[PDB]
Amino acid sequence: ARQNFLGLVVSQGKMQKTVKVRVETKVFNKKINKELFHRRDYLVHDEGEISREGDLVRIEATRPLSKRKFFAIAEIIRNKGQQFALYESEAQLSVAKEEAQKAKEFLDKRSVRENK
Amino acid sequence: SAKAVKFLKAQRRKQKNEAKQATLKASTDKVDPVLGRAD
Amino acid sequence: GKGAAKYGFKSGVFPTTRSILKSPTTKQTDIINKVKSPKPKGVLGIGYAKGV
RNA sequence: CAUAUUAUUAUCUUAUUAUUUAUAUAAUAUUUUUUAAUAAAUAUUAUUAAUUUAUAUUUAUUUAUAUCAGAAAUA
RNA sequence: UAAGAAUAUGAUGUUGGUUCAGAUUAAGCGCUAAAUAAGGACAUGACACAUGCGAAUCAUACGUUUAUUAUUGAGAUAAUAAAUAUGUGGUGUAAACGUGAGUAAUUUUAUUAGGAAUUAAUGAACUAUAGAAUAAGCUAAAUACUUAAUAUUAUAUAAAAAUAAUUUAUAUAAUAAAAAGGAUAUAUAUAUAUAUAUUUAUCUAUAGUCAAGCCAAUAAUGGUUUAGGUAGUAGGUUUAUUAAGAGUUAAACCUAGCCAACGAUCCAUAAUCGAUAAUGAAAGUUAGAACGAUCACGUUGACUCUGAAAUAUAGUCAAUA
Ligand SMILES: [Mg+2]
Ligand SMILES: [Mg+2]
Numbered sequence A: 001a002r003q004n005f006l007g008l009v010v011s012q013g014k015m016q017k018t019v020k021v022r023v024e025t026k027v028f029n030k031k032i033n034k035e036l037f038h039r040r041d042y043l044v045h046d047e048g049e050i051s052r053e054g055d056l057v058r059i060e061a062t063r064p065l066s067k068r069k070f071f072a073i074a075e076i077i078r079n080k081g082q083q084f085a086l087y088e089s090e091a092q093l094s095v096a097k098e099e100a101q102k103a104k105e106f107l108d109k110r111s112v113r114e115n116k
Numbered sequence B: 001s002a003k004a005v006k007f008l009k010a011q012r013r014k015q016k017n018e019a020k021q022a023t024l025k026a027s028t029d030k031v032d033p034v035l036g037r038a039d
Numbered sequence C: 001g002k003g004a005a006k007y008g009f010k011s012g013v014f015p016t017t018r019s020i021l022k023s024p025t026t027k028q029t030d031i032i033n034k035v036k037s038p039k040p041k042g043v044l045g046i047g048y049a050k051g052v
Numbered sequence D: 001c002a003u004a005u006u007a008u009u010a011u012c013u014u015a016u017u018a019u020u021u022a023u024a025u026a027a028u029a030u031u032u033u034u035u036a037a038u039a040a041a042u043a044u045u046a047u048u049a050a051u052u053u054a055u056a057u058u059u060a061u062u063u064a065u066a067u068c069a070g071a072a073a074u075a
Numbered sequence E: 001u002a003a004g005a006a007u008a009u010g011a012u013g014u015u016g017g018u019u020c021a022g023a024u025u026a027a028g029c030g031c032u033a034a035a036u037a038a039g040g041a042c043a044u045g046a047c048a049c050a051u052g053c054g055a056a057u058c059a060u061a062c063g064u065u066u067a068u069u070a071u072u073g074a075g076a077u078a079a080u081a082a083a084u085a086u087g088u089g090g091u092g093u094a095a096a097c098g099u100g101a102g103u104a105a106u107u108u109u110a111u112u113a114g115g116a117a118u119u120a121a122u123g124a125a126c127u128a129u130a131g132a133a134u135a136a137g138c139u140a141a142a143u144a145c146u147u148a149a150u151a152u153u154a155u156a157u158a159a160a161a162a163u164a165a166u167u168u169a170u171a172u173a174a175u176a177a178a179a180a181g182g183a184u185a186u187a188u189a190u191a192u193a194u195a196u197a198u199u200u201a202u203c204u205a206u207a208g209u210c211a212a213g214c215c216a217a218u219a220a221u222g223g224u225u226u227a228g229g230u231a232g233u234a235g236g237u238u239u240a241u242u243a244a245g246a247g248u249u250a251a252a253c254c255u256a257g258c259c260a261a262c263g264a265u266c267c268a269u270a271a272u273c274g275a276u277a278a279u280g281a282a283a284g285u286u287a288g289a290a291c292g293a294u295c296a297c298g299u300u301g302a303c304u305c306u307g308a309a310a311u312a313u314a315g316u317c318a319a320u321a
């Protein structure tokens, strides 16, 4: 079957339809007699542009798509990148609401002291 | 002539990309890591 | 020639044996069922997910 | 300070080749309109061969791009 | 299946280098050398080369040329013998052989029980079956060359599922693309044709063999006193070209990326590897001469034709001699 890898999206949104996926594999270093992780960064095709930095995704081998792109996102295993963007957007309004509320409370308390 | 035209097209393109790299570096939020936003 | 120890201490090589039948045949139900089985997904997934 | 080789070019020159515009009373075949020497039967009618004509395939001519390699400069 | 030794020091213990004992060679040199069997032999100038050889073969492709017999009257045609490849043709030289210049990965090597673009109406040259082998023109003639005749993919309908596509079947569309005859026998008829055959050839189709093209993953020397590099550069979208993906090459438009202190880019150096050789207790290290595998090149560079496949030891142009 096609070559499949599991990796973390480490760079998205800087290239059109392309992300960077960091994958790790188990290798044996005989010089130090140790099982190590060998790391690599892949340029990966993303049709739909659904992935975000920090997602755990499975990439699959494809035909050559550019000079350096040979893999495509096949599945979003874990989607922490999308959740981060959601919370980023939500906190903007969430904070500002109570920020205005408590400023109102501060001004009302100031006025209460004023008219004593 | 044609080489000069192509060279200048490439030079303009490269300079545009470098200037846009600088502008993108300038178009960032730049919050103070210590004191946060001003107010 | 200590590499020969990995191959029964036989020095030199033979050409690899060609397969008379170069694809699995129809009278082999195990491979047919294996290929025609559902394909896994997740960490050991093989193919594109539903929405991708 | 002197000699040598390698690479690069908003430079110059450039065999060859490939593309690329445009031009041929330019050719060889098919299409016409006509002019020539033969044929046969009884004014010809047909054949072979030149003129003009319009489609292909080539050559000559150039336009433009790239190009072995040199030259100049730089490393 | 892992052994140490000499040399510090006034002496001691320790650190520490140097050297030695062992094996070996693609070896050279000095001295010496009997026979036989086997394995090898320009590592350096990919420096220059005298001379001779290493790729020819087919006469049953077509043409020539003689001699005898026969008929016909200088010749003509048959039959039988021969000679001819300084004429036209076919097949054969992409292999093998040699070499290691270049090449540190832009196409190189090694590995994988890896892939797709789902590699073409491609067979190169043998099997197994089938079907064909038709006309002119041109050369002196032809199995030489021309022209002409005849012989999977895209649509649409459904089916399913190894499914968000592929596969299957059908119907169309075009596929729509060839060829070749020689040697012997006879059998007819009127030397002429013809009809059969036995031979060896030609073409087409299907499958099988043998084979080709492309991509991924991992690994592959030293120097950062080479630290920033890169503008087709990194990616997207189309068109062209290709059997076929891809900034591979050409054109256009975009986005601003890509690589790099786990070492980029640059520079230098080097053909690479093994169930091959050396060595060691082993991990490893060394070699890459021999045996084998792969690559690259055939004085140097680029391009082109043919071809399934060539920047071919071919051809064109240039350089060197
Ligand atoms: Mg692309
Ligand atoms: Mg001493």
Ligand SMILES: [Mg+2]
Residues within 6 Å of the ligand: none
């Ligand atoms: Mg010793």
Ligand SMILES: [Mg+2]
Residues within 6 Å of the ligand: none
């Ligand atoms: Mg001998």
Ligand SMILES: [Mg+2]
Residues within 6 Å of the ligand: none
């Ligand atoms: Mg040599």
Ligand SMILES: [Mg+2]
Residues within 6 Å of the ligand: E043
């Ligand atoms: Mg050598």
Ligand SMILES: [Mg+2]
Residues within 6 Å of the ligand: E059
């Ligand atoms: Mg003959």
Ligand SMILES: [Mg+2]
Residues within 6 Å of the ligand: E085
């Ligand atoms: Mg001849």
Ligand SMILES: [Mg+2]
Residues within 6 Å of the ligand: none
């Ligand atoms: Mg060869």
Ligand SMILES: [Mg+2]
Residues within 6 Å of the ligand: none
């Ligand atoms: Mg060889």
Ligand SMILES: [Mg+2]
Residues within 6 Å of the ligand: E100, E271
């Ligand atoms: Mg070499």
Ligand SMILES: [Mg+2]
Residues within 6 Å of the ligand: none
């Ligand atoms: Mg003929």
Ligand SMILES: [Mg+2]
Residues within 6 Å of the ligand: none
């Ligand atoms: Mg022929």
Ligand SMILES: [Mg+2]
Residues within 6 Å of the ligand: E232, E247
């Ligand atoms: Mg490039």
Ligand SMILES: [Mg+2]
Residues within 6 Å of the ligand: none
């Ligand atoms: Mg493209």
Ligand SMILES: [Mg+2]
Residues within 6 Å of the ligand: none
């Ligand atoms: Mg372009």
Ligand SMILES: [Mg+2]
Residues within 6 Å of the ligand: E263
């Ligand atoms: Mg470096």
Ligand SMILES: [Mg+2]
Residues within 6 Å of the ligand: E270
């Ligand atoms: Mg070398």
